[PDB]
Design a protein around this ligand. Sequence first.
Ligand SMILES: O=C(O)[C@@H](CO)OP(=O)(O)O
Ligand SMILES: O=C(O)[C@@H](CO)OP(=O)(O)O
Ligand SMILES: [Mg+2]
Ligand SMILES: [Mg+2]
Ligand SMILES: [Mg+2]
Ligand SMILES: [Mg+2]
Lengths: 439, 438
Amino acid sequence: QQMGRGSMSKIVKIIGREIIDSRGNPTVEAEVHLEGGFVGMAAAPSGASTGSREALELRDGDKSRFLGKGVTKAVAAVNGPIAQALIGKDAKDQAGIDKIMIDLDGTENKSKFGANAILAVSLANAKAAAAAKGMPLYEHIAELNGTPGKYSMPVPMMNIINGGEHADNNVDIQEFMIQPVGAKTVKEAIRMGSEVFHHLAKVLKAKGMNTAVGDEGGYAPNLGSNAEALAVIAEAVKAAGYELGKDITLAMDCAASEFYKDGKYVLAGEGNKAFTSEEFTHFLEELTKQYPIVSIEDGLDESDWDGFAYQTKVLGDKIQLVGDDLFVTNTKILKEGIEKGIANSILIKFNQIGSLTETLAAIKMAKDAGYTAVISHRSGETEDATIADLAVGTAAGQIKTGSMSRSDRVAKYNQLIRIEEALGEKAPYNGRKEIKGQA
Amino acid sequence: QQMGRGSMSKIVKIIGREIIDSRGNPTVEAEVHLEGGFVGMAAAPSGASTGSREALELRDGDKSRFLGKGVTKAVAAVNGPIAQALIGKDAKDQAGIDKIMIDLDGTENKSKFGANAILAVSLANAKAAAAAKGMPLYEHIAELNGTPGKYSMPVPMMNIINGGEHADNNVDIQEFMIQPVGAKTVKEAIRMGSEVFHHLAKVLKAKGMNTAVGDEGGYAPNLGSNAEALAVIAEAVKAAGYELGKDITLAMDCAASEFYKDGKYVLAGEGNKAFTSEEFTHFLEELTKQYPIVSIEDGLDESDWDGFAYQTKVLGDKIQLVGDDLFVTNTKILKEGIEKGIANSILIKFNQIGSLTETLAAIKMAKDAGYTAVISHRSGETEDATIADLAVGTAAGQIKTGSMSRSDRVAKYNQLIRIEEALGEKAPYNGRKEIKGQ
Ligand SMILES: O=C(O)[C@@H](CO)OP(=O)(O)O
Ligand SMILES: O=C(O)[C@@H](CO)OP(=O)(O)O
Ligand SMILES: [Mg+2]
Ligand SMILES: [Mg+2]
Ligand SMILES: [Mg+2]
Ligand SMILES: [Mg+2]
């Protein structure tokens, strides 16, 4: 008899604008407004170590604004042709929204509007539609995902020593992470992570090492070797009163595409020590015997599918092996990997692909093949906490969102604390059992 | 005939929780829920270089959690006594809401509930009320401030080299800042700050210096003296195509309390070189003749009222002199300062005093005396961007909210972008003329 405003879910206005990311570079934000008054807003993150097969981040290249990194062309796409094509379409039909954008762009890699344009609208639409449906974003995402009412709290992997392209130090390995597997709630995980991070500062200070931070909030000391990162972490974990293995495990992201040069893996920080893919796999293996490293991401170059097959055959039964730049959140590429016995896990970045629909497709493909899905930030973030809702609503099981410093990382942890407080035992924290090779 | 939902602004629920700040330490967030379905939420920031007369940041001291930095006691005050005293009160009456809190706590420095509890609720209530009134927080703030419809976009001072308690380096001066006074909009100011900030990384990398960042998102290199920070900034400004003076001016915050020891100022990064008040003031003057430094905060110790009287007599006609730990956003203390010819500017930190009402009273007191008010962050921040709306709604004219890196800082710039986009020329960007002495 009366039609509620929630039913009035057609898009009436889309506003694109240029905001600033956690490195000080421009990025795209969009707002999507519905007839019933609902609004969602979101922003595109931005990577530094970008895989060569990522959907295109469109920047302006005008050296007179922001050293060429303006995003006015992307924002113009949001405000002009994207908006014109979505006005009057039902925001609750996520897959329908995304399809109109992807089709209008018409390109493989989203190079006409930019993946930055399309993603911001895609995520803002989802938020809008959640609110039109009368629910929080994680609940709407589980509905979009085909898994209604099913949630979990992700096991975070927390990058507390930063290197490679994220920092100005002599460390080649991009990320050294802790995982609070012994925690019973993500709130407890967050606190354990904070404690270890603070004890790590004390460890580093006593050795005369720098405690300023890199792009993801972890320390960026100069170390005598990439392995030494592991020793200092171990030290800190023990100083915080925790058992390495039992309470806390380790993970790494090598981002090895960043140090592959003329067909070899070259550790610049270790006097340009060069390795073939087999030898580099053996280097990684020796680390996994000395420390409880249970996950390794991008252990080899994006293009070295032979090397990945090998690595997966030698390490994959025991260790989670995460493809990041290997897969670029891309069903086309993940499928071929799954067929070739390559990796057993994927890092999910909605901006590697450019829409929430395509991102949920990549999570489905991984889950169906027994691969784990790790929901990830980019090194260039904003105060946006969307990935926390994505992790819970897809019950992905794991999240990669930074050190326990910088609100560009800590805003996602706080969103996790909020979600867990509303859901309680409806969103279990499953611990080490979420990680490939431990269940 | 029909009463709208916006009229149902009575408080129905208040929720407190422990969340995490930009250094990884706990802080208090509160949500305030109104009958008509309106919700506000906010969090308390937290300083590292905290004034000895700041209202109390209540922490737990339970060494088994967060190294003793838990805020469970504060959160309990929000969830029990505070909530129970405000449920049923009209959120639109900010002054009454803050009164009930202040009075129930009943101590001078909010040491029963903590200023962290009271502030979180205070701000969350304002958010709720704005929503109930159908308006952005900056517009509700202007009505609460007794200055309806009157706005400006603040001129930011951007701390791009970090020292003292904000960074693990050999720099004594806590902050070295740029201000993009030549900009016509706060959006252009933010662009100019980004550009200079990125040219600064290049200048420091050319010199072999570290480009990791301190707590406020500025670089934290080791330097050969404190004044070297100004030289590298000036290099950066020129490399960015800008003119120091005309486009960009400089500002400092010495946080000199942090290097005051047995009655002298001691520059530990320059071989423990000791200064009396007078000779530290002369050190500062010398920097003001070499570089276009137009504002200096906390040039002396919070307790050295005699020295500030001097510094103001000597430097105050031509430079802005901002009291921070000197005044602790506290009208009782600013009043005595204004009476004794001390400083000509105040740094406004809502958590130094613990309520939005007392913060607006400090802003009023300053403007009535012709002092400027600089709206400030703390070094421990959250994604909260309230200080952007506070700066605009009180047309304070200046803001101190970080380097152009770390979302704990950039969230405030983004919110200033959004505000200016909505207000256009109803919030002018007044540039250089906002600064005391210009
Ligand atoms: O390589 C990565 O996994 C990410 C996230 O840490 O960094 P970037 O956004 O720089 O690709
Ligand atoms: O001293 C200051 O002005 C502030 C803001 O930079 O730092 P803290 O919050 O550590 O007091
Ligand atoms: Mg990368
Ligand atoms: Mg990688
Ligand atoms: Mg201070
Ligand atoms: Mg100070």
